[PDB]
Amino acid sequence: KFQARVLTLYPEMFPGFLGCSLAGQALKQGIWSLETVQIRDFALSVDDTPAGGGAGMVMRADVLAAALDSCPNDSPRLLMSPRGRLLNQAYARSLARSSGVTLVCGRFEGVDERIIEARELEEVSIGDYILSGGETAALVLLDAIVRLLPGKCESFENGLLEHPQYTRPAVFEGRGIPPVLTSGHHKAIANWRQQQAESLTRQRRPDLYALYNKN
Amino acid sequence: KFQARVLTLYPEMFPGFLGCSLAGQALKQGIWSLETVQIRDFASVDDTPAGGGAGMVMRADVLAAALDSCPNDSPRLLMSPRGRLLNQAYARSLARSSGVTLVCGRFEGVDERIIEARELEEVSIGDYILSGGETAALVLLDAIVRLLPGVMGNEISAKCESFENGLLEHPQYTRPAVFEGRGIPPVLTSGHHKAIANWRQQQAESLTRQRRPDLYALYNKNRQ
Numbered sequence: 360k361f362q363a364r365v366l367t368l369y370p371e372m373f374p375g376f377l378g379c380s381l382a383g384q385a386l387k388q389g390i391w392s393l394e395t396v397q398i399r400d401f402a403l404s405v406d407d408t409p410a411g412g413g414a415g416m417v418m419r420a421d422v423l424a425a426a427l428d429s430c431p432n433d434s435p436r437l438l439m440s441p442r443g444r445l446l447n448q449a450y451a452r453s454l455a456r457s458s459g460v461t462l463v464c465g466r467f468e469g470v471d472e473r474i475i476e477a478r479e480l481e482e483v484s485i486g487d488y489i490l491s492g493g494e495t496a497a498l499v500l501l502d503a504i505v506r507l508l509p510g511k512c513e514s515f516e517n518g519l520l521e522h523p524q525y526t527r528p529a530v531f532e533g534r535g536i537p538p539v540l541t542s543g544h545h546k547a548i549a550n551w552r553q554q555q556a557e558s559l560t561r562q563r564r565p566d567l568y569a570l571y572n573k574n
Numbered sequence: 575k576f577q578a579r580v581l582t583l584y585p586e587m588f589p590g591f592l593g594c595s596l597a598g599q600a601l602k603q604g605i606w607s608l609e610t611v612q613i614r615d616f617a618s619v620d621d622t623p624a625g626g627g628a629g630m631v632m633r634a635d636v637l638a639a640a641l642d643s644c645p646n647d648s649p650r651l652l653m654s655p656r657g658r659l660l661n662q663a664y665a666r667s668l669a670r671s672s673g674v675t676l677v678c679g680r681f682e683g684v685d686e687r688i689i690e691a692r693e694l695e696e697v698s699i700g701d702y703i704l705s706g707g708e709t710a711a712l713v714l715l716d717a718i719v720r721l722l723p724g725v726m727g728n729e730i731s732a733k734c735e736s737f738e739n740g741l742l743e744h745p746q747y748t749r750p751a752v753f754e755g756r757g758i759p760p761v762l763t764s765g766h767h768k769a770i771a772n773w774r775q776q777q778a779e780s781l782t783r784q785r786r787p788d789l790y791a792l793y794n795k796n797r798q
Contacts, residue, residue, distance in 0.1 A: 372594055376587040376712065382705060407748040411762035411770045414732065417748035424753075441735070442742040444785060448702045469746035473756040486700040487737050487789075488662045488717045491597055495716045498591065502709045503702045513655070515701050520656045524683035526621040526631035531638070534687040540625035548625050563658055563696075566788075 361391035361508055362434065362459030365497050366426055368405065368466050370395035372494045382505050390510045393501075401425040406467050415468030423463070423474050434459035436480050437500070438470060439493030443482035446500060448513050454500075455507035462500065464493030518571025520560045522552035576606035576722050577673030579648065580711050581640050583619065583680050585610035587708045596726075597719050605724035608715075609644075616640045620681040631683035634691070641675070641692050648673040650694050652684060653707030653714070657696030660714060662735050664697075668714075669721035676714065678707025740793025742782045744774035 365373055373395050374386060385391055398405050401423070406416035427436065434457060437443075444450075454460055463470075463480060474480065485496045514521050525536040539551045560568045580588060588610050592598060600606060613619055616639035620630035641650070649671055651657075658664070668674055677684075677694060688694065699710045721728065736743050747758040761773045782790050 369591075369594060372591040375590050376584075376708060379584055379587050380705065410747040410758045411774070412767075413746065417746045419748055419750075420753040421750055441737065442781070442785070446700055446702050451702050469743065471748055471753070472745035473747070473753045477754055477756070485702075485713070486660060487735075488660055488665050488699075489720070489735060490713065490716045491595060491720050494591060495713060499699070499704070499709060499713060502704050506703065506705050513701075513703060515655060521683075523686040524627065524631045525624040525685055525687065526633055526683075527624075528633075528635055531634040531685070531687050532691055534634075534691065536624045536687075542625075559656070563656075 360389065360458070361455075361505070363391060363393045363462070363501055364396065364430060364434065364459065365393065365462045365464065366396045366398055366423075367464040367494055367497070368398050369464075369492070369494055370397050372498070375498055377498065377501060377505065382502070385505060385508065385510055388510070390508055391505055396426060396430060398422065398426050401429070409469070413468060418465050418467055418470040420471035420474035420477070423470065424478065427463075427478050430461065434461045436461045436463065436478060438463045438475065438480040438482045439465060439496040439500075440470070440482040441484055441487075441489065443484035446483060446485045446503065448503075448516055451500075451503040452507060455504045460500075460504065462493075462497045464497050466492040466494075514556070515564075515567055518560070518567050518569075518573075519556050520564060520567065522556045523559075575604060576671075576719070576724075577609070577648065578606060578715060579609045579611060579644060579673065579675045580678065581611045581613055581637070581676065582678040582708055582711070583613055584706070584708050585612050587712070590712055592712060592715055592719065597716065600719060600722065600725050603724075605722050606719055611640055611644065613637065613640050616643070623683060627683065629682040631685055632679060632681060632688075634685035634688035637677065637684070637688045638692065641677075644675075646675075648675045650675045650677065650692060651714070652677045652679060652689060652694040652696045653698075653710035654679050654684065654696040655698050655701075655703065657698035660697055660699050660717070662717075662738055665714075665717040666721060666733075669718045669723075674718065676707070676711045678711055680706040680708075736778070737786075737789055740782070740789045740791070740796055741775075741778045742786065742789070744778045745781070
């Protein structure tokens with residue numbers, strides 16, 4: 360098994376698109392399971408006014424604690440957040456090797472800092488943009504995990520985007536597959552592919568290109 | 575009325591969660607629409623990479639026909655690991671268009687000639703591999719739709735997030751007054767707005783410095 364547990368205000372978003380395609384099938388076959396936990400059941404509601412003022416509502420430490428504490432501590436506890444460490448492939452690979460993951464989905468403008476500390480929530484961002492709630496990010500994290508489950512290193516992890524890619528037809532709107540690729544001249548092919556990739560990354564992802572140069 | 579068109583092998587993944595909450599509410603009041611185009615209608619979709627490679631490659635002609643089946647009234651984006659990185663600024667830009675056309679790359683590789691010829695701008699949501707572009711498209715929609723200048727709350731919203739300034743958001747506190755021994759920092763209760771803002775900022779600086787040196791470098795550039 361791979362046990363996914365998601366703490367959410369919207370359990371009906373799960374499994375969402377992960378009910379479809381290969382992810383759906385793996386679920387139907389029990390390669391992974393998904394448990395949702397409705398946070399609103401733990402309000403003896405879930406969020407309140409920010410001390411010192413602010414733009415939106417803050418998730419209460421007490422409600423969230425009770426929700427976490429109803430769950431076994433069987434997997435790392437990850438808070439979907441704009442403040443998190445960034446999701447990367449190394450980390451997805453790292454997580455697909457576990458027996459499971461616990462995801463907490465905030466919907467508001469934040470989560471009470473004292474519960475982040477007290478229950479060791481690791482904050483995780485999927486990137487520097489705002490989404491409608493943590494659920495969006497949870498689905499994405501799960502997508503990148505489930506994918507790596509039984510049933511290898513990405514070129515960008517080396518600092519390089521993928522070279523341009525071609526298949527048939529041999530000519531589309533007067534544009535032909537570059538002839539070096541159909542030459543059988545392996546060395547020329549690899550050179551060509553390298554220069555295109557270097558050139559593309561330098562222009563479009565200088566950050567990646569910088570890590571390419573840092574070795 | 576914002577017009578999203580999504581070219582996909584899995585129309586059934588849509589609207590998905592965008593059907594829910596306020597994104598779906600906005601869908602009901604017709605602030606935006608979501609049309610799916612099945613790529614397979616323009617038949618196989620993928621094929622062998624010229625000069626070898628790792629997977630199959632999406633055919634230029636199948637995607638042309640799919641794109642040409644509806645009008646170019648919209649920026650065209652291709653969901654790809656090769657893309658520029660999605661950020662909030664970019665999201666705001668698209669949110670100001672009449673619509674967006676999103677092509678979901680599934681199999682790893684899309685014929686370069688179709689990217690050139692239909693001017694598909696490649697976009698990645700981050701340096702991690704997903705099951706398909708469907709995943710990237712949904713996230714991209716999620717981030718755009720909430721900025722559509724029809725949605726409620728939207729009118730008086732902050733135009734810029736703190737990470738764009740190079741800082742993570744300050745830590746937040748709410749009731750109860752004391753949780754398992756910990757109080758709410760007293761300055762937050764002091765009625766002294768300037769003091770609150772300074773303290774919140776110091777907390778933000780110190781978190782960003784440790785967790786995102788990349789954002790902090792940007793923070794340093796700005797105040798210079």
